[PDB]
Amino acid sequence: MKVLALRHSVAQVYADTQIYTHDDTKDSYENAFLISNLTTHNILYFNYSARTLEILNKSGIAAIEIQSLEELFTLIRCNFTYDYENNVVYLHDYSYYTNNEIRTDQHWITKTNIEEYLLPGWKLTYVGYNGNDTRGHYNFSFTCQNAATDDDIIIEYIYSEALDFQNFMLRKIKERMTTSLPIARLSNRVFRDKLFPLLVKKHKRVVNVGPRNESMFTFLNFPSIRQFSNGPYLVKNTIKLKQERWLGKRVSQFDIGQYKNMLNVITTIYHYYNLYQEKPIIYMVGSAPSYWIYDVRQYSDFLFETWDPLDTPYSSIHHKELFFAKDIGKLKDNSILYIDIRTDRGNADWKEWRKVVELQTISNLNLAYQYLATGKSKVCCVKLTAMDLELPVSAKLLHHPTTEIRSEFYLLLDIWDVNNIKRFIPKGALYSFINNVITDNVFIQSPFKIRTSVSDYIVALYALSNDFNNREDIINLINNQKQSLITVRINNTFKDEPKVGFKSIYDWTFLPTDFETTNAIVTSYDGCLGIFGLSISLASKPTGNNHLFILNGTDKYYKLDQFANHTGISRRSHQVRFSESATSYSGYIFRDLSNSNFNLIGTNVENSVSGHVYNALIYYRYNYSFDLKRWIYLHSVEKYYEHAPIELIYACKSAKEFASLQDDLTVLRYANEIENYINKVYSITYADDPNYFIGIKFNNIPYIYDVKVPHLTFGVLYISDNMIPDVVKIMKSMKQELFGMDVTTSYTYMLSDGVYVANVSGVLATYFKMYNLFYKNQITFGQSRMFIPHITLSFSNNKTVRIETTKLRIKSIYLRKIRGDTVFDMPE
Amino acid sequence: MKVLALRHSVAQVYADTQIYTHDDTKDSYENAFLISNLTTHNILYFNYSARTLEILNKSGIAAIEIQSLEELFTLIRCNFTYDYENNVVYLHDYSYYTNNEIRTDQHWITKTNIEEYLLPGWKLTYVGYNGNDTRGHYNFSFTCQNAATDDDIIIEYIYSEALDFQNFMLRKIKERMTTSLPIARLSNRVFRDKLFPLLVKKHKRVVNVGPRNESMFTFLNFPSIRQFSNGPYLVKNTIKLKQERWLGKRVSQFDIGQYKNMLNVITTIYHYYNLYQEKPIIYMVGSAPSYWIYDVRQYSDFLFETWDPLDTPYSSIHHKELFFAKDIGKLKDNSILYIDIRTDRGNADWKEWRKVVELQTISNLNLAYQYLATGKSKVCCVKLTAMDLELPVSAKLLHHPTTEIRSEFYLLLDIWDVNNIKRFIPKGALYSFINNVITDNVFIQSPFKIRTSVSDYIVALYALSNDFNNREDIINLINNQKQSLITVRINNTFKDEPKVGFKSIYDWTFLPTDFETTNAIVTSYDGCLGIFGLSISLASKPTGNNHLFILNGTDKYYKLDQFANHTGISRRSHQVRFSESATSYSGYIFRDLSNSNFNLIGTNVENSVSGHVYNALIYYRYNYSFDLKRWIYLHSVEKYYEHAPIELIYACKSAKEFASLQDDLTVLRYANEIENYINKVYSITYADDPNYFIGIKFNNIPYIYDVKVPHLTFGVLYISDNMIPDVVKIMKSMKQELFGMDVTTSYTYMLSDGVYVANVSGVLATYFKMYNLFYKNQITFGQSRMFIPHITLSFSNNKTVRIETTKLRIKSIYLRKIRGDTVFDMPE
Amino acid sequence: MKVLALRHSVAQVYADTQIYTHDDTKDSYENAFLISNLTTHNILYFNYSARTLEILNKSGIAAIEIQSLEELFTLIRCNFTYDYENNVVYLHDYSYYTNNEIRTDQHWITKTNIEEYLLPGWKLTYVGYNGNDTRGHYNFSFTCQNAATDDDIIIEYIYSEALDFQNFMLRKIKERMTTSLPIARLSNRVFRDKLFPLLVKKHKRVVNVGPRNESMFTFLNFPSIRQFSNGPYLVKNTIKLKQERWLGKRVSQFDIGQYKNMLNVITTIYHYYNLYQEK
Ligand SMILES: Nc1nc2c(ncn2[C@@H]2O[C@H](COP(=O)(O)O)[C@@H](O)[C@H]2O)c(=O)[nH]1
Ligand SMILES: Nc1nc2c(ncn2[C@@H]2O[C@H](COP(=O)(O)O)[C@@H](O)[C@H]2O)c(=O)[nH]1
């Protein structure tokens, strides 16, 4: 939506493409509301106050100050993510292709030969995390940087099994200049970066579920988190594999040895974090060039100590040019040891040189056992060729990709992988692992058992919703659990399909109303950006991979008009009402017809009902950022605004009817889901065949009438005959809000056959309040019909006569017994 | 789109929902273009000239003057159709439901009992054609009236076989306040009203194909038109029907006798128009109340002469209260006779009263034959019960609906239906016609044989495209034919589906490129509104029942920038470029990558190619109002603007690539459809391995270089050695447009391996003209590659160096022989 | 699958359309197994023992004895349901249309004017439950009767809001001679008839869920069952309804007063059974 707030005396409207203008000083949050229901994508907000920007930025709507026009305004056009507490703009613009470069955020790729393999004239540069080395280009009122990088192209290529690179990047560079910017994907690395370091301090613990190599680096300075994912591959499960022979396969023009050397270490550490919430010393041998070190130090600071003949530019201590051979007792315990002692064949005979590779492998294991023989908290990660070896069963294999597959895989070990566990593995049982099994993830820790906990702050962002997880176990994990941040997918389709996918995998799909939480928000992506200190410039789409977010047990459940609020509620309706092929009164006509006020749709300008909810139900696909359920519970019990209980049912009933004609079975369910939850948090009682009624007499009715005493039957009630004395309290306590309300009549109509009446206006708000004061005093009041206030005139069938809006005022009020000869109260 | 032009000194921007503002005086044509590529639906145009409104209104964009704010501006919000030559606004607002009425445009329904059968409190009123009796409510700078009526509800109900009316209207009134305004359907009755009376005078003849009861009244003052439709039902085809017995069926609460009495006459007339191109006297008997007369006189003026005992309010001469019995020679020939001599049973015994009904029927036929025995040009339409009768084979039966089916059907006769043609029909062969066959259409004239004609101005608006018509015959009717106005459906879907429908019937679907017309427009609905004097406020949707319109042989083929012009061309692109999830340079990057200028996408701000067409190809679903084909043929031969031939191929080639990734096989076809039509109206030749070239030398190159003589190879050509003397004309005739063009260089790049070059800018427009000048002199010039102008510097591989934009100027120009030692021309 | 067991010395293979033959004495249940994995729909089983037929009939495979060829074999071609303990064949053949009749199992429709409203020449007759008045036509080694009736056409027409009957039946009679015999639907009324009376005497208390007017008559001699279904419409829920006026609507050429007079009583009873397990 991208609100751009411009200087009062310096501000221009030009022939732009998606620009509305807004300017007012009515009330701060009412202004932000009126903005947030505006249609277009780019809005100029000419005279402003900081609090109107606060509310929007809190609502996930990116709203920012603009002080100048030449570059501060033209470059903040493009889409972005805004941290509204440190005033940093994370742009997501792929217009940097124009000066003919790609850009990464990993230093190691710069030292490859890759620029030989890019298209002619292109380069890569500006290597910083989130583009934090971009900010040197711009000089604004705010800090700014373009976090768009092409990590996708390079990393997918490695996992792509394709060999021509120019063909590859030319394909993908054309995909972005064709298809939609995936913002929900780029804003997450921003979100993840600030999401954990505050969460860890606030709760003192955290568990994450399903981390992928999106987060290879997020957690390197967080030992005290415990991540769970797909389990590892074990030596225990090589016995499955069919035998196979050397397969010389090349899948990368440019050498990516530094990438696996980075991953195998990183895997080794998250393992060490899994066992001992700790963080180690990191010894190394055989790995000099190590341009992947500087990538690591941008996140967490580790002590790297290396033994290699060649240059290690990035380390604390490069101890020797000798490679660590048997001086092994000189190591500290709190450690990991990464062994990559190797060789390179020259032109020597492969059949005889193979003998050398076998002997190193025997040695490299002897180093591993002697390491793990003495001290506790020691983790190894050792180099192996594919030959017959005696390996521990419970150990974990790794084959992160490389330049080319030529018979080697790495093994990592723990202290208990030595304690009397050993198996013999044949040769071709390893090649069968090498050649077909690519390791996918450095996070090889055990799966998350789906059950509630009370010490755990559980995060689960894109791990659950998979079809293979028990639906009810995740539901109960969400309902019967405090302390979390869970994400699940919304049922964004019609005909209520419970499982939705890509023709590869299906995922479980939810509505908001699957969950009877106790104190929790259930909002969208943009809403939770606001909760955690962020705001985004692009709105969510009605279809696509939208996801419910669920915050349990948080400080912000009571702060309703701040976070996950009624912002954005009517944005799509206004499009339908005025523009997209309908009359402006379409919603004002339908809901009265569907609630049996179909004779009268004149007074549907004002005094209609079913405001917030009817929009929340039929356009949930757009505005599920508004947690409807949280809105209702906090008005059951006053913890601004107030509507009657009755109005919410009519909002539900009309959405059913609407979804019936449309045949949108998902709204139709969602309407059923709500209305019996409305009848849950509070009951509703109906004096269907009442005994008493509240009546209002007037001085003079400016119409023709044959009924001997015209009156307004203001409401009916069914009570016991000694709760009159506490009904009259309310007759008394609001006597002037009835004498003081603008009763007006302007016309006659036909309420029904043989019942010719007037219309009364301007009274309902008092009628809705009265309903609530009788309510909490446990007094029945009102019928299941819609109370349309009317003054009876005659039992005939006549013509609607219009007069000027003539004010009527109250003779008296009275509480009358139906078919009785006496009353007991009448204010005056 | 609804352009609203506001007063200069009286004009307000407020917190509205779909408002851009535009204001400029750069150009009249160029301003309307910039408007027409604006996104939103409602545009305020603050300072204006009449010609900018003319162009838009001519482009189908409704653009109107606004002089005041209170009601002239607030009520012109809603959608409408505008006749920009008489300044009449036809609104299409269904907000008249609020004062609780429906509205018709047929006087006869007001005299029914229907208001007993409407929902309680509702009425019907304001009965005028197109709402021409609405204009008394509004006092504006323009004439105005709300042509929205509820004829749908009433007429469908009659053809609906449902009996409860309150249930019916409540259903349909809720359909409109739910679903999209069918603006295209509503604007046609406006279109049809002014479409024919001018067309008839201009060509002196006209044939229409597939008229429905949308047009019961359009043609009543047009004898000289010859309509064709589904043939009639004949007595000849009762021999099929199984025997059946009396079926007492009631399908209308309210009496609709006046409706069939209206239809049977109207059928009788269009028949008489079919036989003789003249228009009759219209005698009647048995039909007094005849409140349907006033409906007829609002369109065409006929002489009605009636014989009935009861009151005929609306007629010329109600001759007698006796009903026309045997004084039959006293009738004029040029006539139709409508017989409805009948009775009404009281409480008499149905078994004996039936004998009376039989005798009238014998009499009513004797009247019919005695009528058609004497004079020529006489038609009848007679009342019959279902009994065994001796009927002419070739006669035509009618059972337009009624209140209730109780055994009667009407028969119409022509002069040749008496000349020795008679058959015996059994009783139940008529009930089987009555009870199951509802007549659908008063237009019972023979079908249109699908073949070309040269005297015929053929209209065909929504009759063709049906799956049962031979596709090629309608194609050839469109291609091999002048003098017409044909409509066909567009292939608005993807994966190139040739036939599309509603799961009831399928219809043939076209692209614009199915047709090699000679002088014809192929545009949208809104474009042809402009051509005929109309403009509409709502844009067409990318999917839905869009239809190509085809105007053959019209005066407006050469007037390109007026009608069916490049208006609206980039509206959807601007949405994609800036807002809907992409960088603004996305289109500027893709088309260079897809045309092998992928090394360089820096100079894609300006000097890119493929402007109009690439947008016409991938977003044809939005902007098929622009006839791409007409645009190209009129630039092949100059009959403002000019682009080279080369640019159009690259526009086509890139749309293919675009549609390949997307897998939109319809653009992919449409690209193939165009490019070989580009190679049709004009050839393109390529000096792929040339002999000569045009070279340009400069004073000094502000770069490093190792080539001994840096030069711009401005273009290459393959010619004979004695067409040098007419090549040199062109260099001489444009020597200063080369000396006078802003040659500039700003950087170096890699054109290819071992070719390090500079970039030249600002020259291409002269290069494109030069290609055109050589072209028509039949000289080869240019290669199939894209000519990216470059100055060679060195045969190495180096780094892009940026400098300030430094102007370079021309030493000389020269025409050089490739690997030769001499030249023969050099300007200076 | 329709196993037809033929006499040893009297048995013929002819040029038939879906016939395998099987004959062996290996082992009783191994033989039935080998049969039950045979492809075709009609199987001749030439020399047999009763226990091989028992197993199949217990397996849901209809397997029956055939003693003669002229009519006991040619008419047991068509599809059927077999009660293998009382040896009754419930045929499901709609070939009775050929002698130009429909057939019901409710006596009241015969006293209407409906034969004025059938297609010319047709009639209705043979009104018995499950066609239990059909068995007078056939003289077989087993009891037999054609339980195919056209209750669908008549009852749907009443619930159809359509008024022309000849048009109606001609439509539906053509649906059956077009589409597949719904056997899983016709065999249930057989199933329901014997399913409950034995359950009742075996289990002291029973309850049924979602009965429809398939079973208007199944339960009339079972008070001690407690059926549950969609709740009633109450006077309590008229307050919803919009006001409306007399609507004269005719949806049945022939008078069906006897049908509602039957239903209103029957409703009244199952109610009385619901309150007081009584009759
Ligand atoms: N009673 C009530 N009315 C509201 C509330 N919010 C908006 N409205 C009404 O709904 C209108 C919405 O205007 P719109 O967004 O359709 O232009 C407001 O102008 C106001 O009349 C609310 O919270 N409570
Ligand atoms: N050569 C040429 N360029 C055009 C033509 N029409 C528009 N353009 C270019 O395309 C641009 C379109 O701007 P946009 O509508 O994308 O903001 C114009 O500003 C102009 O540079 C045309 O007819 N010929």
Helix (H, G, I), strand (E, B) or coil at B369: helix
Q: Are A809 and A701 in contact (CB under 8 A)?
A: no
Phi, psi of A364 (to 5 degrees): -60, -25
Gap between the Cα atoms of A568 and A619, Å rounded? 11
Query: Rounded to a whole number, what is the distance in angstroms from the first to the last CA of chain C?
Result: 43
Q: Are B600 and B759 in contact (CB under 8 A)?
A: yes
Q: Do the bridges between strand A206-209 and strand A225-228 make them parallel or antiparallel, or are there none, so unpaired?
A: parallel
Q: Do the bridges between strand A408-413 and strand A378-385 make them parallel or antiparallel, or are there none, so unpaired?
A: antiparallel
CA A176 to chain centre: 23
Atom 21 in ligand 2: which residue has the minimum CA distance?
A: B606
Q: Is C245 on the interface with A (CB under 8 A)?
A: yes
Strands of A471-553, DSSP E: 484-490, 499-501, 506-510, 520-523, 535-536, 547-552
Decide: residue B725, CB within 10 A, 0-12 exposed, 13-18 middle, 19+ buried: exposed
Phi, psi of B479 (to 5 degrees): -80, -45
- Cβ-based contacts under 8 A for chains A and B: 204
Strands of A246-352, DSSP E: 249-250, 281-285, 304-307, 317-320, 335-339
| C114 neighbourhood in chain B, CB within 8 Å | none
Atom 8 in ligand 2: which residue has the minimum CA distance?
A: B611
Gap between the Cα atoms of B430 and A710, Å rounded? 60
CA dihedral B294, B297, B299, B303 (to 10 degrees): 150
Nearest ligand 1 atom, CA A643: 1
Q: Do the bridges between strand B206-209 and strand B458-460 make them parallel or antiparallel, or are there none, so unpaired?
A: parallel
Phi, psi of C232 (to 5 degrees): -80, 175
The sign of the CA dihedral B59, B62, B68, B73 is negative
Q: Which residues contact B742 (CB under 8 A, 6 or more apart)?
A: B761, B762, B807
Task: Single out the residue of A674, A303, A352 nearest to residue A514, CA to CA.
Answer: A674
Nearest ligand 2 atom, CA B570: 15
Residue A432 token pair: 């069968």
Gap between the Cα atoms of A438 and C224, Å rounded? 67
User: Which ligand gives the minimal distance to the CA of A33?
Assistant: 1
Q: Of A599, A605, A661, which is closest to B174 when you measure between CB atoms?
A: A661
Residue B411 token pair: 């028969």
Residue B568 token pair: 């609206």
Closest residue on chain C to B165 (Cα): C247
Partners for B (CB, 8 Å, 3+ pairs)?
A, C
CA–centroid distance, A608 to ligand 1, in Å, is 10
Q: Which residues contact A707 (CB under 8 A, 6 or more apart)?
A: A792, A793, A794, A795
Residue B99 token pair: 């004062």
Residue A102 token pair: 């790609």
Alpha-carbon distances of C154 from B23, B547, C169, rounded to whole Å? 73, 47, 8
Q: Are A804 and A757 in contact (CB under 8 A)?
A: no
Q: Is B252 on the interface with C (CB under 8 A)?
A: no
What DSSP character marks residue A234? B
Q: Are B309 and B286 in contact (CB under 8 A)?
A: no
> Among B20, B570, B607, B642, which residue has the most ligand 2 atoms within 8 Å of its CB, making it the best to mutate?
B570
Residue B224 token pair: 């000289």
Neighbours of B809 (CB within 10 A): 13
CA–centroid distance, A770 to ligand 1, in Å, is 21
Backbone torsion region of residue B693, taken as left when φ is above 0, otherwise alpha when ψ lies between -120 and 50, otherwise beta: beta
Of these residues, B39, B711, B744, B766, which one is catalytic? B711
Annotated binding residues of B for GMP = 574, 577, 588, 591, 608, 612, 615, 643
The sign of the CA dihedral A574, A575, A578, A584 is negative
B685 an active-site residue? no
CA B439 to chain centre: 29
Strands of B641-691, DSSP E: none
Crossing angle of helices B525-532 and B183-203, rounded to 10°: 40
Of chain C residues 90-119, which have a CB less than 8 A from chain B?
A: 116
Neighbours of A62 (CB within 10 A): 27
Residue A249 token pair: 């396969």
Residues of A with a catalytic annotation lie at 711, 713, 790, 792
Phi, psi of A548 (to 5 degrees): -60, 140
The sign of the CA dihedral C231, C236, C239, C241 is positive
SS (H, E, C) B715-739: EEECCCCCCHHHHHHHHHHCHHHHH
Neighbours of C139 (CB within 10 A): 9
Q: For chain B, how many residues are written? A: 828
Q: Are B827 and A127 in contact (CB under 8 A)?
A: no
Gap between the Cα atoms of A142 and A19, Å rounded? 23
Q: Do the bridges between strand A823-825 and strand B335-339 make them parallel or antiparallel, or are there none, so unpaired?
A: unpaired
Gap between the Cα atoms of A816 and A719, Å rounded? 12
A802 in a labelled binding site: no
Residue C253 token pair: 């050429």
Gap between the Cα atoms of B636 and B634, Å rounded? 6
What DSSP character marks residue B447? P
Phi, psi of C206 (to 5 degrees): -130, 155
Summarize chain A as % helix, strand, coil (round to 5).
Answer: 30, 20, 50
Decide: residue B73, CB within 10 A, 0-12 exposed, 13-18 middle, 19+ buried: middle
A612 in a labelled binding site: yes
| A120 neighbourhood in chain B, CB within 8 Å | 599, 750-753
Gap between the Cα atoms of C184 and C180, Å rounded? 11
Q: Do the bridges between strand B225-228 and strand B249-250 make them parallel or antiparallel, or are there none, so unpaired?
A: unpaired
| A604 neighbourhood in chain B, CB within 8 Å | 98
Q: Are B116 and C247 in contact (CB under 8 A)?
A: no
Nearest ligand 1 atom, CA A574: 16
A574 in a labelled binding site: yes
Say whether C243 and A784 touch across the interface (CB within 8 A).
Answer: no
Task: Single out the residue of A179, A202, A274, A263 nearest to residue A231, CA to CA.
Answer: A274
Task: Single out the residue of A391, A413, A426, A437 nearest to residue A236, CA to CA.
Answer: A391
Q: Are A574 and B17 in contact (CB under 8 A)?
A: yes
A342 in a labelled binding site: no
Q: Is C248 on the interface with B (CB under 8 A)?
A: yes
Say whether A177 and B582 touch across the interface (CB within 8 A).
Answer: yes
CA–centroid distance, A68 to ligand 2, in Å, is 28
CA A518 to chain centre: 20
Gap between the Cα atoms of A215 and C132, Å rounded? 76
Task: Please enumerate, as own/partner, the contacts of A48-57 that have beta carbons within 8 Å and a separation of 24 or more.
Answer: A48/A5, A52/A28, A53/A3, A53/A5, A53/A84, A54/A84, A55/A28, A55/A29, A55/A562, A55/A567, A56/A3, A56/A32, A56/A535, A56/A567, A57/A82, A57/A84, A57/A530, A57/A535
Say whether B243 and C120 touch across the interface (CB within 8 A).
Answer: yes
Task: Single out the residue of C8, C148, C142 nearest to residue C84, CA to CA.
Answer: C142
Identify the residues whose C-beta falls under 6 Å from ligand 2. Answer: B 37, 570, 574, 611, 641, 643
Gap between the Cα atoms of B233 and B393, Å rounded? 11
> Among A643, A647, A769, which residue has the most ligand 1 atoms within 8 Å of its CB, making it the best to mutate?
A643
> Among B37, B577, B610, B612, which residue has the most ligand 2 atoms within 8 Å of its CB, making it the best to mutate?
B612
Q: Are B33 and B25 in contact (CB under 8 A)?
A: no
Gap between the Cα atoms of C64 and B771, Å rounded? 93
CA B381 to chain centre: 37
Helix (H, G, I), strand (E, B) or coil at A678: helix
Residue B466 token pair: 């049906």
Helix (H, G, I), strand (E, B) or coil at B458: strand
A132 in a labelled binding site: no
Q: Do the bridges between strand A547-552 and strand A520-523 make them parallel or antiparallel, or are there none, so unpaired?
A: antiparallel
Neighbours of B458 (CB within 10 A): 22
Atom 3 in ligand 1: which residue has the minimum CA distance?
A: A611
Helix (H, G, I), strand (E, B) or coil at B349: coil
Q: Are B745 and B735 in contact (CB under 8 A)?
A: no
Q: Are A687 and A717 in contact (CB under 8 A)?
A: yes
Closest residue on chain A to B754 (Cα): A120
Task: Single out the residue of B183, B242, B193 nearest to residue B220, CA to CA.
Answer: B193
Neighbours of B39 (CB within 10 A): 21
Q: Are B586 and B599 in contact (CB under 8 A)?
A: no
Say whether A688 and C239 touch across the interface (CB within 8 A).
Answer: yes
Q: Breaks in chain A follow which residues, C to N over 2.5 Å?
A: 639
Residue B697 token pair: 């030398």
H or E segment and range at residue B191 = helix B183-203
Query: Which amino acid is it at A98?
Result: T
Residue A765 token pair: 């708000």
Any bridge partners for residue A382, and if so which? A411
CA–centroid distance, A611 to ligand 1, in Å, is 7
Residue C18, CB half-sphere, CA atoms under 13 Å: how many?
11
Experimental method: cryo-EM
Q: How far is A118 from chain B (nearest CA, A)?
A: 10
The sign of the CA dihedral C219, C225, C229, C232 is positive
- Cβ-based contacts under 8 A for chains B and C: 25
Residue A536 token pair: 């985004």
Q: Is A11 on the interface with B (CB under 8 A)?
A: no
Residue C107 token pair: 């006596």
Compute and round to an integer the Cα radius of gyration of chain A: 35
Q: What is the DSSP string of chain C?
A: --EEE--SSS----S-SSEEEE---S-HHHHHHHHHT--SSEEEE-S--HHHHHHHHHTT--EEE---SSSTTTSSSS-EEEETTTTEEEE---GGGTTT-EE-S-GGGGGSSGGGTSPTT--EE---GGGTTSGGG---SSEEEE----HHHHHHHHTS----HHHHHHHHHHHHTTS---HHHHHHHHHHHHHHHHHHHHSS-EEEE---GGGTTTTTT-TTEEEE-SPPP-GGGSTTSPP---------SS--HHHHHHHHHHHHHHHHHHHSS--
Site of tokens 């079926």: B247
Backbone torsion region of residue C126, taken as left when φ is above 0, otherwise alpha when ψ lies between -120 and 50, otherwise beta: left
Decide: residue B151, CB within 10 A, 0-12 exposed, 13-18 middle, 19+ buried: middle
Residue B278 token pair: 């003249």
Gap between the Cα atoms of A240 and A379, Å rounded? 27
Backbone torsion region of residue A750, taken as left when φ is above 0, otherwise alpha when ψ lies between -120 and 50, otherwise beta: beta
CA dihedral B129, B130, B135, B136 (to 10 degrees): 30
Nearest ligand 2 atom, CA B33: 15
Gap between the Cα atoms of A527 and A55, Å rounded? 12
Helix (H, G, I), strand (E, B) or coil at A824: strand
Compute and round to an integer the Cα radius of gyration of chain B: 35
Of chain A residues 570-629, which have a CB less than 8 A from chain C?
A: 596, 598
Q: Are B411 and B382 in contact (CB under 8 A)?
A: yes
SS (H, E, C) B44-106: EECCCCHHHHHHHHHCCECEEECCCCCCCCCCCCCCEEEECCCCEEEECCCHHHCCCCEECCC
Q: How far is B217 from chain A (nearest CA, A)?
A: 28
Any bridge partners for residue A552, and if so which? A484, A520
Task: Single out the residue of A521, A520, A497 nearest to residue A509, CA to CA.
Answer: A497
Q: Are A600 and B119 in contact (CB under 8 A)?
A: no
H or E segment and range at residue B488 = strand B484-490
Q: Is A25 on the interface with B (CB under 8 A)?
A: no
Gap between the Cα atoms of A786 and A770, Å rounded? 15
Q: Of C239, C242, C243, which is closest to A784 when you measure between CB atoms?
A: C239
Q: Are A802 and B99 in contact (CB under 8 A)?
A: no
Q: Are C69 and C77 in contact (CB under 8 A)?
A: no
